[PDB]
Amino acid sequence: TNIRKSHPLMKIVNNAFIDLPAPSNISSWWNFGSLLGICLILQILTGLFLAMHYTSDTTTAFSSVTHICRDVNYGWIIRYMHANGASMFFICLYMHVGRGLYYGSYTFLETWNIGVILLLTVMATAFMGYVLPWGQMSFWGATVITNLLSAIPYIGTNLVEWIWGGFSVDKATLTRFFAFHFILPFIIMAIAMVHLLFLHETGSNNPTGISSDVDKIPFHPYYTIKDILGALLLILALMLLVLFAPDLLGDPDNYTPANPLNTPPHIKPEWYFLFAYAILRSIPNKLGGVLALAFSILILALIPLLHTSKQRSMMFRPLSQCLFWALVADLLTLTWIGGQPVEHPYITIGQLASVLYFLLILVLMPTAGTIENKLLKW
Amino acid sequence: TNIRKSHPLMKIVNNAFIDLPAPSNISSWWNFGSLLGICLILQILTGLFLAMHYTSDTTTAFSSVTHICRDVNYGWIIRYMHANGASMFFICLYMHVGRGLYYGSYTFLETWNIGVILLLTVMATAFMGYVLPWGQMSFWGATVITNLLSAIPYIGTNLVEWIWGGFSVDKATLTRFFAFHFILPFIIMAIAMVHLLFLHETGSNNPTGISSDVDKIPFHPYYTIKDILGALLLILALMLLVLFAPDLLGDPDNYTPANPLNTPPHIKPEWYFLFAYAILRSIPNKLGGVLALAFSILILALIPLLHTSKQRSMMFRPLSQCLFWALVADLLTLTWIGGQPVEHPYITIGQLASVLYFLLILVLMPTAGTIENKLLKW
Amino acid sequence: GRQFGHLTRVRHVITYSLSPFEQRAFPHYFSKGIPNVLRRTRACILRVAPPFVAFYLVYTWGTQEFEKSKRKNPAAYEN
Amino acid sequence: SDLELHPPSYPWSHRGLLSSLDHTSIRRGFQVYKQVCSSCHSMDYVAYRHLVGVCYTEDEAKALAEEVEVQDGPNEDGEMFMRPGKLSDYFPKPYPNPEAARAANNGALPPDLSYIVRARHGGEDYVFSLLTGYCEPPTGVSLREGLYFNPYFPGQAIGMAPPIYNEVLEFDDGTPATMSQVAKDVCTFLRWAAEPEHDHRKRMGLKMLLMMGLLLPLVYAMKRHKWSVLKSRKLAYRPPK
Amino acid sequence: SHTDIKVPDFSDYRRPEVLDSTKSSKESSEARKGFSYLVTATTTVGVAY
Amino acid sequence: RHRTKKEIDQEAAVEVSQLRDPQHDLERVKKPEWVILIGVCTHLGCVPI
Amino acid sequence: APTLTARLYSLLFRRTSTFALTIVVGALFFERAFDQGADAIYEHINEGKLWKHIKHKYEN
Ligand code: HEM
Ligand code: HEM
Ligand code: HEM
Ligand code: HEM
Ligand code: HEM
Ligand SMILES: CCCCCC[C@H]1C(=O)O[C@H](C)[C@H](NC(=O)c2cccc(NC=O)c2O)C(=O)O[C@@H](C)[C@@H]1OC(=O)C(C)C
Ligand SMILES: CCCCCC[C@H]1C(=O)O[C@H](C)[C@H](NC(=O)c2cccc(NC=O)c2O)C(=O)O[C@@H](C)[C@@H]1OC(=O)C(C)C
Ligand code: FES
Structure with missing residues (x-):
């Protein structure tokens, strides 16, 4: 009898990537699940090696990182792989969610939802991540953001100071964030498995949204090697940054230590929050700005309630296909604006892009869907 | 249909402590599995709150802990619950393994073995744990021990300095240990689940070693409440220490910072390594001492290969029952000697206790078993 | 994993039981309790106790000789 | 020197299970610390504010804090002047460099006092006994310079002068500063300086x-x-x- | 033959309001449940604190 | 360490072939009245008293 | 005239609503009364407090 099937442990492994039936059909947009996995472990792995040298304490924070980069044998590649892997973890997270909407994958409620929980957590994690080196961006990045909870009626103040450990960002705040930045990726890693658990309940969706039961292939050969190649590609990219352009995606001013006295007129969160940043300030309101910022992400959990189409994938849906790309480009817009100062053109256009975003996901795509139904006679 | 049974998540929870059939028969010696669980989380939980205030850096190490105890609102109970919970985690670990031998539970190879892996890891964890406050015991405790790998032929030196980050214990060594002391309990927590996975494959053994299939009861009511009461008892004990005798099990000299110049003629690892300590130095050899220290624990993984009896539990085995207690008392001996200076009576008696230990587990218990067979006509 | 209904085979046994709300949680707690723990203690003293007094004897004699080895040391050094 | 003796069980007002410290007695003790020990014994962890809820009161703490002059933060020219006394900072006192403790008291380190009751076996009683113990060397024996005699001490050869009976005072309301009354109070305070x-x-x-x-x-x-x-x-x- | 099966006597375990074969147990129904639930209510009030 | 005349003579009298690590005292010092050593025990690195 | 426990069951324990309502209502009053009596017991057996010490320093 084949021990690969009856042993309590292997079962799991057989079910994960050996015998599990998958669509003969999936394409590259399905790789980002392994890539996110890889990202998660590599992040956990370099992250740990930095912790054997990092510190905390506001006095030594910045000093330790430089210590690593200059003194620690090879500390530089580790440090930069960590910081660059962090960005890659967003590119993939972004692509994953993308793949998801286009193809209708979100119809797996539990799975999609666990994925939203996976999004907020890696966001919450990466945020704490950059506060650590204790640079300029780290300090006010850690300030501009956190504050937002001060917009919450009646108790906002209390919470923001409770998360702070003082009346501002200092002593109590760096150690806190380090510890949280340490325990979160483990918790995420658990949630991921539950994400994956619920996924195995239905198997994978595919480019046509049809149903591949009629043509499944074994994960064995097929998707293991198509995951390896894929991961090699992810390595190429991560290494391209680290080894040729280490600070290309990094704000040069998180160098130069903190300073509660300064604040360098510019300051934006790391690139991956720009679209969100743009939204928040494209609203003349403390409450509204943050309320809108929240909705900006928590709307993913709303998408399935506005599936209106009789087809699952957008593979055969030109109308929606157009609104999808309009969404992407528009997000690329928000990212760009977020990156600019709150001045003349930039204000009104980022204000339009915001409205577009919400109007597109909340009114346009759902209508495009119904018209397509009507066109097909459905 | 009952969602408590078909939902991918609940299944697990139904199987863990709701519908799982258990012996109507188990007694208090089976509680230490929940207690170890509780221990593990509570340890993880206070441990984390200390990390939001602790540091690392040899300069601030000791200072931060006192900061917590004196300045941090309630930092003292947290700190002391952590340190006392650590001891309790050993009392239970000890009791668990005890329950195990007596009752023959070790016949579940995979489960027993995962449990040995669980033992070494919490040992390895708790070791790193006490190096953290950077006290006297912490420094040489961290020195006397670690060194041992320097007894390994040809490469001992290399490894001990590799684990050190220098030529002695300093900078590189405290941050390292903190990080490892942080990631280990998570890894342990995983291993625990696999331990528990393999356990569910057979269900639980019981006081008679017979087989309770003929009389199983639902974990629902029964063992959930008998686990609650039990946990309350564990709280009583943990709180008795923390709130009445905080340093009773703690070496008073881990107070007073480090000092690579000193070394206070006494020094012993925390109580839970005393029996092991005694063994090692009860041998006039660098290689033999450490070799014997290893065997002292790695012998558990040998026990099943020396099951000789035709009955499973010792419930009906007076001969072995006697050798069991002789083992316990003898371990209580090793603990006591370990706690004493390497002088007159203490040497030869701790030297006898060592031999006894190995001769008892390796020759005496296995023979007691065979004689019992012969007595019964088996 | 193993569920009720697929455990094992049982022939002819009746089991009468009673609702918890219909009986006492502590029937004869002391009346029948004490006698029994005496009985279980008795039943096991001889296999549990002996190794412990042995340790006990070796512990008191061990420290004794440890003090009387040094403190008692002088003793005599007469010239 | 190889042989030793351990302390007795002085019935402290905080030895019993649910027993609070004597706050009146913690007071006098701080006094014993300030006038006597403070010029040799660092107490890096306790502060004037820590005393606020315990023994003294708001204004009183301020005043005792002002009776010294600590080196405050640098100013515009990169100064580092001196200032009255806050409440904020601790009791970092006697010596800068640790070896400067050795240069004063002949080659001996009078260790931090925040430690004490939990860093020495016996706790209060060992410090109580070590202070009120002070006896005279019998036969055999030696001594170098003034490596004073003390039975309740590892080896019996301390480097600490017996600053006990020098009757100093300020036991407000009226308290006889006898050797023993002075020792109980230091310890009682030292207990609190270790386990607030x-x-x-x-x-x-x-x-x-x-x-x-x-x-x-x-x-x-x-x-x-x-x-x-x-x-x-x-x-x-x-x-x- | 299955009519030889009498349920064994329990007087030895019964709550006192329930010893009489001639007394309806509905009378002490409330009292008995009340007590055990009060026991857990208090308990949980204790954990709550 | 400054060794006295008595200590020098005592080390020179030690039976060399009985040693675990055979070495004469005069090959471990340059001046007999001075022994200079690394305060590190060869077993597990503790500090010898 | 039924029983205390009986009447108690009917009006508050029967429904898991009122049952739970009773305990949250019952925990509030318990935390208060247990903290009073407790601290009081703690003081009565002591008296080297900073409570009876204040009377001396209302001034400065
Ligand atoms: C911790 C970060 C995440 C990890 C590690 C992760 C891992 C995976 C893996 C391995 C797959 C299967 C392979 C694939 O389809 O690519 C997958 C599919 C999926 N994930 Fe995630 N994912 C993460 C974040 C998300 C996010 C952000 C969402 C959406 C909010 C999400 C919802 C989904 C859904 C709906 C699928 C099904 C895809 C399909 O069937 O076509 N997960 N994920
Ligand atoms: C639990 C494994 C992890 C550990 C032990 C860890 C620990 C650390 C430490 C000590 C630093 C400061 C050193 C430095 O800045 O280079 C850091 C920086 C950071 N890590 Fe992590 N982290 C871990 C997982 C993650 C995860 C999941 C993310 C999210 C992708 C992440 C993204 C970051 C970011 C954004 C920074 C700061 C950015 C920068 O280096 O400039 N790390 N981490
Ligand atoms: C991370 C520490 C450990 C945890 C959390 C843990 C958890 C548990 C739990 C919950 C049970 C079932 C309840 C019980 O029998 O008490 C159990 C049983 C068992 N464990 Fe562990 N245990 C740990 C360490 C060990 C050790 C040290 C061993 C032995 C080396 C061990 C081998 C066993 C065995 C053989 C059983 C079966 C007991 C029986 O059937 O009677 N595990 N454990
Ligand atoms: C991952 C959760 C844990 C974290 C975050 C954690 C973190 C810490 C930190 C920061 C300290 C230094 C503060 C102090 O000494 O009080 C410490 C001390 C310690 N913890 Fe942990 N630890 C965790 C799990 C454990 C585990 C599993 C054990 C083993 C029972 C453990 C046993 C110890 C010990 C022995 C010490 C030093 C003893 C002492 O306090 O005197 N902790 N821990
Ligand atoms: C009531 C005020 C004082 C107290 C309570 C006090 C208490 C102590 C204690 C408990 C020790 C360490 C005992 C041990 O190692 O077991 C010590 C060491 C010492 N203190 Fe004091 N002392 C006080 C005032 C002084 C003064 C005024 C001096 C200046 C002569 C002084 C100089 C020393 C020295 C030199 C040592 C070193 C003893 C040694 O380790 O060899 N201390 N003291
Ligand atoms: C340790 C490595 C062993 C792998 C076991 C864990 C990893 C795991 O479960 O492996 C399989 C490979 C899992 N699914 C896929 O990859 C996958 C599924 C459909 C299609 C493709 N590709 C192309 O069509 C895929 O690649 C996947 O990729 O999930 C990872 C997030 C998870 O990783 C995790 O959980 C982390 C929490 C560890
Ligand atoms: C988060 C709390 C939910 C519980 C799920 C996890 C916990 C879990 O799985 O629960 C059940 C309760 C598990 N078994 C028992 O307790 C148990 C089994 C037989 C008998 C008794 N008692 C008396 O005869 C028991 O108590 C047990 O106690 O294992 C713990 C170590 C595990 O804990 C773990 O994994 C940690 C890795 C979390
Ligand atoms: S004798 Fe073992 S470390 Fe010195």
Whole structure:
């Protein structure tokens, strides 16, 4: 009898990537699940090696990182792989969610939802991540953001100071964030498995949204090697940054230590929050700005309630296909604006892009869907 | 249909402590599995709150802990619950393994073995744990021990300095240990689940070693409440220490910072390594001492290969029952000697206790078993 | 994993039981309790106790000789 | 020198299980610290504010803090002047470099006092006995310079001068500063300088016992209920024929 | 023959309001449940604190 | 360490072939009245008293 | 005239609503009364407090 099937442990492994039936059909947009996995472990792995040298304490924070980069044998590649892997973890997270909407994958409620929980957590994690080196961006990045909870009626103040450990960002705040930045990726890693658990309940969706039961292939050969190649590609990219352009995606001013006295007129969160940043300030309101910022992400959990189409994938849906790309480009817009100062053109256009975003996901795509139904006679 | 049974998540929870059939028969010696669980989380939980205030850096190490105890609102109970919970985690670990031998539970190879892996890891964890406050015991405790790998032929030196980050214990060594002391309990927590996975494959053994299939009861009511009461008892004990005798099990000299110049003629690892300590130095050899220290624990993984009896539990085995207690008392001996200076009576008696230990587990218990067979006509 | 209904085979046994709300949680707690723990203690003293007094004897004699080895040391050094 | 003696059990006002410290006695003790020990013994962890809830009061703490002059933060020219005394900072006193403690007291380190009661076996009693112990060297013996004699001490050869009986005072309201009265008070304060949480700890401890005293029986009667179905169950075996 | 099966006597375990074969147990129904639930209510009030 | 005349003579009298690590005292010092050593125990690196 | 426990069951324990309502209502009053009596017991057996010490320093 084949021990690969009856042993309590292997079962799991057989079910994960050996015998599990998958669509003969999936394409590259399905790789980002392994890539996110890889990202998660590599992040956990370099992250740990930095912790054997990092510190905390506001006095030594910045000093330790430089210590690593200059003194620690090879500390530089580790440090930069960590910081660059962090960005890659967003590119993939972004692509994953993308793949998801286009193809209708979100119809797996539990799975999609666990994925939203996976999004907020890696966001919450990466945020704490950059506060650590204790640079300029780290300090006010850690300030501009956190504050937002001060917009919450009646108790906002209390919470923001409770998360702070003082009346501002200092002593109590760096150690806190380090510890949280340490325990979160483990918790995420658990949630991921539950994400994956619920996924195995239905198997994978595919480019046509049809149903591949009629043509499944074994994960064995097929998707293991198509995951390896894929991961090699992810390595190429991560290494391209680290080894040729280490600070290309990094704000040069998180160098130069903190300073509660300064604040360098510019300051934006790391690139991956720009679209969100743009939204928040494209609203003349403390409450509204943050309320809108929240909705900006928590709307993913709303998408399935506005599936209106009789087809699952957008593979055969030109109308929606157009609104999808309009969404992407528009997000690329928000990212760009977020990156600019709150001045003349930039204000009104980022204000339009915001409205577009919400109007597109909340009114346009759902209508495009119904018209397509009507066109097909459905 | 009952969602408590078909939902991918609940299944697990139904199987863990709701519908799982258990012996109507188990007694208090089976509680230490929940207690170890509780221990593990509570340890993880206070441990984390200390990390939001602790540091690392040899300069601030000791200072931060006192900061917590004196300045941090309630930092003292947290700190002391952590340190006392650590001891309790050993009392239970000890009791668990005890329950195990007596009752023959070790016949579940995979489960027993995962449990040995669980033992070494919490040992390895708790070791790193006490190096953290950077006290006297912490420094040489961290020195006397670690060194041992320097007894390994040809490469001992290399490894001990590799684990050190220098030529002695300093900078590189405290941050390292903190990080490892942080990631280990998570890894342990995983291993625990696999331990528990393999356990569910057979269900639980019981006081008679017979087989309770003929009389199983639902974990629902029964063992959930008998686990609650039990946990309350564990709280009583943990709180008795923390709130009445905080340093009773703690070496008073881990107070007073480090000092690579000193070394206070006494020094012993925390109580839970005393029996092991005694063994090692009860041998006039660098290689033999450490070799014997290893065997002292790695012998558990040998026990099943020396099951000789035709009955499973010792419930009906007076001969072995006697050798069991002789083992316990003898371990209580090793603990006591370990706690004493390497002088007159203490040497030869701790030297006898060592031999006894190995001769008892390796020759005496296995023979007691065979004689019992012969007595019964088996 | 193993569920009720697929455990094992049982022939002819009746089991009468009673609702918890219909009986006492502590029937004869002391009346029948004490006698029994005496009985279980008795039943096991001889296999549990002996190794412990042995340790006990070796512990008191061990420290004794440890003090009387040094403190008692002088003793005599007469010239 | 190889042989030793251990302390007795002085019936402290905080030896009993649920026993608070004597706050009046913690006061006099700080006094003993300030006038006597403070010029040799660092106490890096305690501060004037720590004294606020304990012994003294708001204004009083301010005043005692102002009776010294600490080196405050640098100013515009990169100065580092001196200032009255806040409440904020601690008691970092006697010497800068550690070896400067050795240069004064001949090659001896008068260790931090925040430590003490929890860093030495016996706790208060060892310090109580070490202070009020001070006796005279019998035969055999030696001594170098003034490596004074003390039985309650490892080796008996200390480097610490016996600054006990020098009757200093300020025991407000009226308290005889005898050797023994002075030693109990230092210790009593030193207990509190090591374990400030001491009284709260035991206050909770009372509740912990009092709570468990209702819970243990209850959460136990609960488990009985549920197991009673099993405990009084009756079996009958009725095979065919 | 299955009519030889009498349920074994329990007087030895019964709550006192329930010893009489001639007394309806509905009378002490409330009292008995009340007590055990009060026991857990208090308990949980204790954990709550 | 400054060794006295008595200590020098005592080390020179030690039976060399009985040693675990055979070495004469005069090959471990340059001036007999001075022994200079690394304060590190060869077993597990503790500090010898 | 039924029983205390009986009447108690009917009006508050029967429904898991009122049952739970009773305990949250019952925990509030318990935390207060247990903290009073407890601390009082803690003080009565002590008296080297900072409570009876204040009377001396209302001034400065
Ligand atoms: C911790 C970060 C995440 C990890 C590690 C992760 C891992 C995976 C893996 C391995 C797959 C299967 C392979 C694939 O389809 O690519 C997958 C599919 C999916 N994930 Fe995630 N994912 C993460 C974040 C998300 C996010 C952000 C979402 C959406 C909010 C999400 C919802 C989904 C859904 C709906 C699928 C099904 C895709 C399909 O069937 O076509 N997960 N994920
Ligand atoms: C639990 C494994 C992890 C550990 C031990 C860890 C620990 C650390 C430490 C000590 C630093 C400061 C050193 C430095 O800045 O280079 C850091 C920086 C950071 N890590 Fe992590 N982290 C871990 C997982 C993650 C995860 C999941 C993310 C999210 C992709 C992440 C993204 C970051 C970011 C954004 C920074 C700061 C950015 C920068 O280096 O400039 N790390 N981490
Ligand atoms: C991370 C520490 C450990 C945890 C959390 C843990 C958890 C548990 C739990 C919950 C049970 C079932 C309840 C019980 O029988 O008490 C159990 C049983 C068992 N464990 Fe562990 N245990 C740990 C360490 C060990 C050790 C040290 C061993 C032995 C080396 C061990 C081998 C076993 C075995 C053989 C059983 C079966 C007991 C029986 O059937 O009677 N595990 N454990
Ligand atoms: C991952 C959760 C844990 C974290 C975050 C954690 C973190 C810490 C930190 C920061 C300290 C230094 C503060 C102090 O000494 O009080 C410490 C001390 C310690 N913890 Fe942990 N630890 C965790 C799990 C454990 C585990 C599993 C054990 C083993 C029972 C453990 C046993 C210890 C010990 C022995 C010490 C030093 C003893 C002492 O306090 O005197 N902790 N821990
Ligand atoms: C009531 C005020 C003082 C107290 C309570 C006090 C208490 C102590 C204690 C408990 C020790 C360490 C005992 C041990 O190692 O077991 C010590 C060491 C010492 N203190 Fe004091 N002392 C006080 C005032 C002084 C003064 C005024 C001096 C200046 C002569 C002084 C100089 C020393 C020295 C030199 C040592 C070193 C003893 C040694 O380790 O060899 N201390 N003291
Ligand atoms: C340790 C490595 C062993 C792998 C076991 C864990 C990893 C795991 O479960 O492996 C399989 C490979 C899992 N699914 C896929 O990859 C996958 C599924 C459909 C299609 C493709 N590709 C192309 O069509 C895929 O690649 C996947 O990729 O999930 C990872 C996030 C998870 O990783 C995790 O959980 C982390 C929490 C560890
Ligand atoms: C988060 C709390 C939910 C519980 C799920 C996890 C916990 C879990 O799985 O629960 C059940 C309760 C598991 N078994 C028992 O307790 C148990 C089994 C037989 C008998 C008794 N008692 C008396 O005869 C028991 O108590 C047990 O106690 O294992 C713990 C170590 C595990 O804990 C773990 O994994 C940690 C890795 C979390
Ligand atoms: S004798 Fe073992 S470390 Fe010195």
